[model samples]
Target chain A: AEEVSNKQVILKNYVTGYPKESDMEIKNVTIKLKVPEGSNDVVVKNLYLSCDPYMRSRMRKESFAPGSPITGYGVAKVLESGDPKFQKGDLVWGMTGWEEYSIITPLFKIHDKDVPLSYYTGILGMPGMTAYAGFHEVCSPKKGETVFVSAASGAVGQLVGQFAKMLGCYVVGSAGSKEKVDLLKSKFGFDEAFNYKEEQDLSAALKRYFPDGIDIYFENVGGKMLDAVLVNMKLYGRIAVCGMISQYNLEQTEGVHNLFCLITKRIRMEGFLVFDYYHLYPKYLEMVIPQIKAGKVVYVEDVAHGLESAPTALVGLFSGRNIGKQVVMVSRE
Target chain B: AEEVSNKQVILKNYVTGYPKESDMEIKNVTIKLKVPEGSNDVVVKNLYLSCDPYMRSRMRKIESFAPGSPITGYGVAKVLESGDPKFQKGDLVWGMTGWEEYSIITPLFKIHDKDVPLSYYTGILGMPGMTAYAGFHEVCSPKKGETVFVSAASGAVGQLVGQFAKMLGCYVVGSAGSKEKVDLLKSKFGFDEAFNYKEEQDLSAALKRYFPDGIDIYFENVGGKMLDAVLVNMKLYGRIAVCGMIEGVHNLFCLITKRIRMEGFLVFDYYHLYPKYLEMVIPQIKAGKVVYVEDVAHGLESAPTALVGLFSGRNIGKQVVMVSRE
Candidate 1:
């Protein structure tokens, strides 16, 4: 078995507000790339970590406890192992230690030697489940529902819009930057894209884009934009609140005033965690693996090199710096 | 049969945005309160008439015409005879009749007998059933786990409220003026408890005494002050169906910010199912036999006087005008 230095980042504390890069630091640590002695856990090295905005919420004071590893998900490889579920040199993806050479008690393991191991971090992993559950389960698209996805160019949002477009809905998305705005329309097959930061009136811009009011609003950002969407949403509209990145930073969340529209129009708004719908992942593989093979689906990588680049790249997603799935590459396999 | 001339209180024209009682008038256009010789309909000399607040809505010109008569409901008597199978001379019926002494009609009949009294026309027999039904059915839909609060307890509509509360597995309440009315609600109708809406200084205070949590369904009868009270009294997800503004005139401006869905309803919308409704109701009345009381303000000369008294909190129980000769 190959021995490895446990070069890793240990989460210092649960973040209070807008998390700073200073909140976490890369440290030199060591661990056996093999399972801990007499334990069923497998020792593996993290290959890729997809930094998403929802991870910021998990770092929230209530969301994560003190001294708990700053939580996230990634793709890893079994270097050496003790668990019968896995053995040395097996490629897998799921909850493992964040630092290099982690002894992971398997939440679940990925076994497809056919696909890129990094695909386990995104299109085939939790983000993959996000697209499956949110678009298919929550929105319940029936070919032509006018679907709107917020944070259009981000990891989960990008996949959501793509999934909607694939399902034959007229997809529209909102982003913060012109570059992301372009990437969303050009790459993600969103029928329409708008830079919410550039538009003075978010509601008016959305109205201009969708003349026939929105039917499904896959909510990633929640705040003023949510209020605007509430006004223009059609009767019996469906809102799947997959994330609320906009208000996740603020201590006091703004109450939406147009909530009365919920009763008048009979709209259904719900919040769900991805873990609740993890059973749909193989089904996710059934749908997405084909698209990946046929080049019908392609994911843009906003990857930063090394564990050191993880800080800026993680926080940058909030300000719309990363265009696609923001990836942190830890090691070569 | 005793002979009498029948007169009507017709709304001359549709009033603009808001309607006043002045929009109505008790005009004497004489007609024999008896059916013509060969007609299929009965001439009903109105025994009782109801002056309800929802009638004010009928006074307004609707953009689209509602199928039937403009005036909503009244309680009538059989005066001049006709060929209708269900009614004859002296048969008392309560349904949609014009505000006339006698209405000549083909349909709209609910004959009150030994079981249900003549005064149930103004209450359980008339607009209140449809109001109570739709108000409970669609608007403030009670689903067993809910609590309901009704304003103006002992009146025609509020008295029957306790029975509905029991039917829906709900906690019931009613607000009346006198302690006698309060006692009647608890003792007669089997209400959970009743309060004198006038006695309590704060509507919220009166509400807090009974409901420590909050009210889930509020059948609104009094709009402004009691409304301000019920607003503070409402549970987070309360349902309010605005039945009438008995304590004051109907003012849409008064409750812009209350957030409760105070909907204006005309009972005629439920008239399509009159046969189906009477089927469910008449049997229930036959089996359980709901109780009602009428403060009979007898005679046509006293009709205007009886209606005006409704505003002042003068008439006790269900106010009825005996516009027919015995």
Candidate 2:
């Protein structure tokens, strides 16, 4: 067994309100790249780390233990494995530590190498499955349905917009900045896109874009955005609440006044956790990777290199700093 | 064919906010007790008219209902004349009809039981019962021993839902506006616990005391603050069968963190399974396993008073206007 110094990001204390970079500290530890004898842990060298909005909840210590390396889903190369399913050199993505190497058992081995491996942290992994299951399974979209997505140029949002478009629907997206707005229409091929921050009234912006009404709303940003979307939903419309990053940082979430429209319009708004749907990852990749290969889908990654810059980049997600799916590149090989 | 005088309730204008009795007016119209040739309409002598909270939505000009006219709603009536093959004279039917002594029903559902009170068709055996049944079974998908909570728990839809949850072996709790209604819920409907929401200064704290482990299914009747309170007490993957308009903020962060499924529905969406609903409920009604209470107004003149009483929680149970004797 070879021992090496591993650089790790550790949670200092339970966080409250919007997270700050100072709340996380980088620590150095030495580890032997070997699972203890008879142990089933699969040790891997973390290659890429994913910074998701859901991670903010973990920062509060509800999910992660104190003094543990900030943990999240990441793409890594297997160094040693006592588990029967995973072996040495196996490429996998699942719950891994923020350190250079992690020991985990339950993870999916990389099946397709043609697409970028870093994609395992995003479009081809958790967020990808989120977009697929949320759009197809939850929304149950039909042809020519008008689809609207919040945080549309985000890792999950970008794919949802393109997926809706691929199915022959009118897709609209809203983001915080002009760059993300332009990326939605030009890069993601959304029918229409808007900068929600610039728009004084989101409802009016939605009405102007969707002359009729919205059939599906992929909710990533919550609060006022949800209220606006509620009023604009067409009869029998569906809202798939995949994330509410906008409310994640706020001390108090805004109330939705137009929720009454859900009854008059017979709308269905549901929230789902992506972890429950990992069994569909293979099926998600089967459908999604081909789209990626065929140029039917375009995935954009906003990469932040080195473990040193990881905390700053993650905290930036709350402030809408990252361009697309934010990935922390931990190692090159 | 015989010409008869028909007394009716007409909407004064499109109503707003809490409705008042003055929003309605009584009028008399003459109608022939016959289905004209080539017409498929069934003429029904309206016996009992149901006053439902959903009727408030219709008081205003909306897609489902228009004002400045005789309003239509669920009623128990006898067929006086029929041009439709499905209905014949003297047959008892219940469905959409005018709020008057006599009505021309385009379509009506046939009531098979002669033993049970026909007025039950206007309530437990009709739309409100189906709303509670389908909203709980189809949407909430209750498992035995799951924690269930109902707001406005002694009202038309609320009472039946608590009883149904009890039957499913769920830990049922209900909230109403009065101590009497609260007691009626626990005693008559077999709710495990009941409370008067009006007495509670903090609804969320009250809910926390009842639902210590959090609520699995929230049968939402009243919205606004009640909904906001329930949001904080919902378990992961909890289902909210929203049968009414409601909201508040601050705890929506809980909605996402908790991964709740809050949905809105109308009984019309599930009314297609009317016969299916009747099969399950009739046995319970016959065996005395389930009972429905009604607040009856003796005449057509009392219709406005009965309806206006709904917002104020003036009715003990399902409010029905007895327009005529059977």
Q: Which runs in model 1 stand beyond 4 Å of their true positions? A: A1-4, A13-16, A32-39, A79-83, B1-326
Cα lDDT for residue B154, candidate 2? 91
Model 2: lDDT to the true structure: 0.87
Query: Which residue runs of candidate 2 sit more than 4 Å off their true CA positions?
Result: A13-17, A32-38, A61-68, A103-106, B16-18, B32-39, B61-68, B253-259
Give a tens-digit lDDT track for model 1, residues A1-333.
Answer: 456566666566767787778877776754545556777877777888778777776776536554444547888777776778787667777766556667767656666668777777788888878877987997767888898889877778888888888778999999887888888888888999998989999889889988979999988887788878978887668777777778767776555445545544556565556777888877788888889888888787677878887877777876667767878888785
- lDDT score of residue A290 within candidate 2: 84
Interface RMSD of each: 13.2, 1.9
Q: Model 1, DockQ value? A: 0.07
Best by lDDT: 2
Tell me how candidate 1 scores on lDDT: 0.70
Clashes of each: 2, 2
